[model samples]
Target: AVRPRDHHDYADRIALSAATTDGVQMRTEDVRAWIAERRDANVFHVERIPFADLDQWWFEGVTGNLVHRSGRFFTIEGLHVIEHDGPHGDGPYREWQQPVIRQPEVGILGILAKEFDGVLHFLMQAKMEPGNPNLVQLSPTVQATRSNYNVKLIEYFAPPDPERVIVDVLQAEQGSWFFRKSNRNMIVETVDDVPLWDDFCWLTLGQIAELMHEDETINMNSRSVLSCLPYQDITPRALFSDVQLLSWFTNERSRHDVRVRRIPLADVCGWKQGAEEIEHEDGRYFKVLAVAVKKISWTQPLVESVDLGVVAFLVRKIDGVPHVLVQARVDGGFLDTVELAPTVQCTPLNYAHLPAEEAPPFLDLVQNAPRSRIRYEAIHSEEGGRFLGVRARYLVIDADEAIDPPPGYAWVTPAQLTALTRHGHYVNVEARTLLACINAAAAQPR
Candidate 1:
């Protein structure tokens, strides 16, 4: 008997595509017009329906939590988080209660890749989620849970042969609004002729990166799957070795004594629930609202941010290789205590009342940087499935290498961060999007 070997040179093939902007299937610049054409061809509308108008959804009097009658979709509960002001904590001690989405099901966020003229091209969908401000965005080939499975996207969920699967892993979603939520981020390569639809297109990684330059063109789920792509790294050296970065992150996690507990939605303070929405007294952070999408009679409870957020990765090149300033940030919903986040991952409105010194570190540098110093900037939304119009300006700012990094912060190369994203919980969703941009912009030349 003879054993057949599986394909193992994906990194080189992926890196080759990333280096060249031209795609054999479609012209890179023609993608936007294509997306706009698809947008015009489809019908999408979302109405903010009153809580009483929600179909099959009930605000259970038992806990004041919102849930679907089927008990399978998801529920809106409350969470109380406390980060003690101590030597180990990364920021000042803080405590707050907010409504959170609780769903235990694992959904799939898959992107299909195929070789066109010896160059790999990925299948991207022009998808719509009611909560996205623009309605339609560039999405992965398949983004669905088992409940609907969306049926049409077959041969995906899993193919019998292992060779077709290029990348598959469980990755967490938005840590702030979701309670221990995760989706299977996947990339599959196919030799079979995949059917094309009006809503889908084929593009190289370079074309995808070019789109990232435009604001909110690529959806959050698409960026997550791209970050997980195994593009090879060939930097001569890194400022700090992989283990050095790991031990530093480990120590940072141990120093913080963070605690979180789930409570009844009815017990949450500073928030008032009405027929239309659930909002904070100060109207500072966010709100919980209901909406009906696609289906005139539907189900949805979305978390809407009060304002646009700022998410920037401060970078400085060391000995010719670029290094990003990453912080070990804490969010109540993270399964692990902390994940490496961008230098400034916050909504400014939450702190407009505070003193200038209280602002997030490097926020001003990112916001005030001259156009030349701004390496990359784009607007990307949180998971639009649950977050209503929640988007943040993603920026990459160049800082002087002379600036000293504080505890809980480390300077690592884009290649290093890309490797970290291959695993789970090491990188937060916001940072992962930035890493996707970086890989698109700074991918190793083949």
Candidate 2:
């Protein structure tokens, strides 16, 4: 784990506003009013952006209905598959998942940081996206694909040449199928104090995590970056013993077998293709649709699309400390046969009727949890390429008691989960989202 020069605890940090427990400044009112203005603005209109037809030779061999598009900024690829099976139960179960493959042209998802009065502060943006469930969300200092970022933003914030940098980690995207490779997750510190913009604010790591608890307050990109935030090296004071667990996982890793075979879109069953969108016969889960992105800042229009689905987690505390139940889940496209997954990782169709006994242990607790007990929940968009309206719900439940997890499941403390992330391929994106939430919740004023 990468350790900062100092542990900047912001527990008693003075509140800049009463809107939050930590007194962090929130632009909720400003964000809401701005979005309201946008809704009423006459400049907003929808028009189809031009793109080659999917049936064309341009996408001859792709398996799913979606096709690939490469721009000066980034490349958007088609539907990919994730095949896996594990302790949770049985083999190469194939699932169609969306991934955003970022070309070098798209630049990076970067965060700017500085230290003030012994506290480490990060630059964050309160921005909105077209498919955001809420008006405005707390985004990274910069969350732009190559196509979205102009030359200046890319030059100053991305890669080897970036100014005032500290460490950069090429963090993997949530789902591997969407991204052609991986998201270039970056963290940099500036010696020159950077001024905050109207929609941008400075926050400590603790403050950022605290804000994550509220519904739709923070976007998925920011959460993804926060999930990469490393802490001091593992200390002796751990909540749970990992000796036996790690040993078990190590032995169990080879016990299961997984075989992945890519199938063409024409061979996929139950999907009905239309001139506009490709959807399932039952009209559930997600559909493949296109969008023409005509931003005033762009020199030309960009065509985009995606397959949306839900990524949720159920949390419960064992003893007094919080413990999240993660499963040895296997995705068809996973780098490994078994990586950690959330309590429930399914599309709307699978989730709606997943037999309770067959699903993750205590999944019902999350589904049936009272509104008041639901800790963190939000509907955020997937990668912008292959998924248009592809949005997912990042959720956490407050379990009143410990649950007896099934065979492939384990109730792990946050520290152990963080440690697992170091192994690379050990935790899936869905579990990481929940881990980010749990890490944030632990940092709160409680």
Candidate 3:
């Protein structure tokens, strides 16, 4: 079959939106106050509660997996993973077991784009997430798993015209905690006038980019959808050819031996179940805790990270274009066993006791990166709906052009990363957020 053809103007329209900081709908500076007002209006009443207090949630006596009475949303189960001869061999490269969320449904994190005057503006929601550290962060226009979706956005718009769909692709979530979870990232354009609410507002790409510099102002789901927005940057050349890069990535994927099995939560070893939470005896990675939200009868279980993580992309200007160092990381929950993650994606607390030689290659560099060397740095939260206060310091730091990375890592441009994002299972969530930062940084009008 032949190609569907390229829409060059799509990228041009996106670039125009990205360059417009002051939108016709809302002032860039006023967007922050609007978000604060929305936060004050819709505060989350959340409190930590004992797992036994979860009304409809129960550990199945037979499977020992946490399940909802309806069983429509999601479940917390165990995943037994083994990775021998891993690409970088983060640890022993043997085997391990941990808790993972298994939701066999597709997530719809979409943005509705419309032209206001001449520039395009995206519909944004000042949404409250139960697990967001700030409680209220900016979310996408239409965000939900289709299984639980209310379809307010769809019904109001009467379903977007298929030809006007700008970007529609399936993207993977955090592979560490999500078991083969994928979200359908969409950006649809409409000429029809849409209604607005106090909690909902319109924003430009440049405005969103400006907030990306802030700490936890935008949610991960929004960033995920943003990363997929295509923008063709003017690039004369790259350090590595696209074919060579793909070949190297394929080689890296070929070298790894990843084996995983979904098991009952009862079978997950090393993690001890207590009244309040299920945590590893050593208390290294994360803890599974339940929360009483809005005094609802059915409490939700969220993965509480023990410590903040650091995700960085080491960059070096290669013949003018910025090239970022990406790691071919193998997380237990990824469907394809591996995806291109940030140069450094580690919780410093987890490696506090590890010897220097055993630590991740760029951990020290990222942690010690001075302000001058840091390109973009901000504290962003993880999947807030499923994670409890799980935040990470995302950074893009400078690297020497001559510096070389260890095995299973490669230097690619942000445009290259964006190109890979057009497909599935190529780039991980953390790296995609960094790519979004890069796009936002460049899209800002000089």
Candidate 4:
């Protein structure tokens, strides 16, 4: 979680203008400063310039397509209305199945509200694998139970250049686990503090796409490499490869230094494991043991049998090179080995740390844009068991239709994007319209 900034410093703050389809408006220095104040210092900090600005336009009462390049998510809101058509049900019950609707596969708001039968009517979508940026989009899939809810935007903060505005939301679902998801981001040139007509900005997809293409620079050095447990299976034998190595030394061997401590996992719970430090037989450095459960399923409809697919291994080094040590059998398995290297991560152009000569190509793939929506994707195995094989797979993505993925990238499925977005992004909608859509669906003839 990033901490908010203190108000004492006004030296670093700057202001810029933003516009809705209605007209151009100005953002006060105060609002810009406030937004800067709330920025998370750990991941990003506020800067004086914006990456770009968007002029949004929304259809009066119809569904519109909004796309943005720089950010990971999209947002849509206004005095939108929904009408229902279905078999007669009581007023309270009617809202559930009344106004049936559907959206394109890539669309977020439509899927969550019409597809998932959830409440709140809000849609959220974003990449699930943050460091990779290629995971499935997880849509929140919300559909409220209430008769109606009104939605109007009060205002939104847009960021300036190099200060990637990654929107991360944190909320408690009462008895449920706390939810934290990071949606799309914007590299804005400026923002308007004032609200549109009635405190809102009705954004369309085209506007966002236009904004995303404003800066066009592509560099291989600026890309990011995902850091999941499995990383020792995909590499060519090379002397200087960025390999995951291993190294270890006993306390007795270092007794003369007298400055070593053994820490247990329980004592450092919630702490991210540092870089690999275990040693190999040849005194080389490499990775440690780690595992993740990808999926689980039952053999029969009655759920009698089950299969658990998991990736369990201890990565080590041989002759100063890194190798993965896989457990041979499902239980008490012996070890099988493989090598992995050539993995790296980098910062984006919207961040302050972006290399002067290297930066990711900005693209507007987000559905809503400056505003965001979510989607979720699930990978199921026909084997009706836990599917651990998915861990060996990486989230492959194509920001555009023009080119195939480079050699190193994997080809992930569209469903994966849906899952990541539904589980990852953030969106807010009225409770009322959501119910109307639900009631109409429920009352439809079988």
Give the candidate number with the greatest lDDT: 3
Candidate 1 C-alpha error for residue 255, in Å = 1.3
TM-score, candidate 2, is 0.73
Model 4, 214-273: lDDT tens per residue?
A: 111100000000000011122334222322111111111211211111122223222222
Q: State which candidate, 1 or 3, has the greater TM-score.
A: 3
TM-score of each: 0.94, 0.73, 0.95, 0.18
- Enumerate clash totals for all models, in the order shown: 1, 24, 0, 93
Number of the top TM-score candidate: 3
Q: Candidate 3 on 195-255: residue-level lDDT in tens?
A: 8878788888988888888889888999998998878868946777889888998887777
Per-residue lDDT tens digits of candidate 1, residues 28-71?
67877777776666587788878998888888988988988887
Residue 23 of candidate 2: its Cα lDDT?
20
Better of 1 and 4 by lDDT: 1
Q: lDDT tens string, model 2, 101-179? A: 3344323667776666555677777664544444355667876665553432344474544335533555455444433
The list of candidate 3 runs beyond 4 A from truth reads: 1-4, 86-92, 156-160, 295-298
Once fitted onto the true fold, the runs of candidate 2 whose alpha carbons sit more than 4 angstroms away are 1-107, 134-136, 144-157, 160-167, 176-181, 195-199, 232-245, 262-269, 294-313, 351-360, 371-373, 377-381, 384-386, 389-393
What clash count does candidate 4 reach?
Answer: 93
lDDT pick, better of 1 and 3: 3
The window of 10 residues in a row where model 1 has the poorest summed lDDT is 151-160
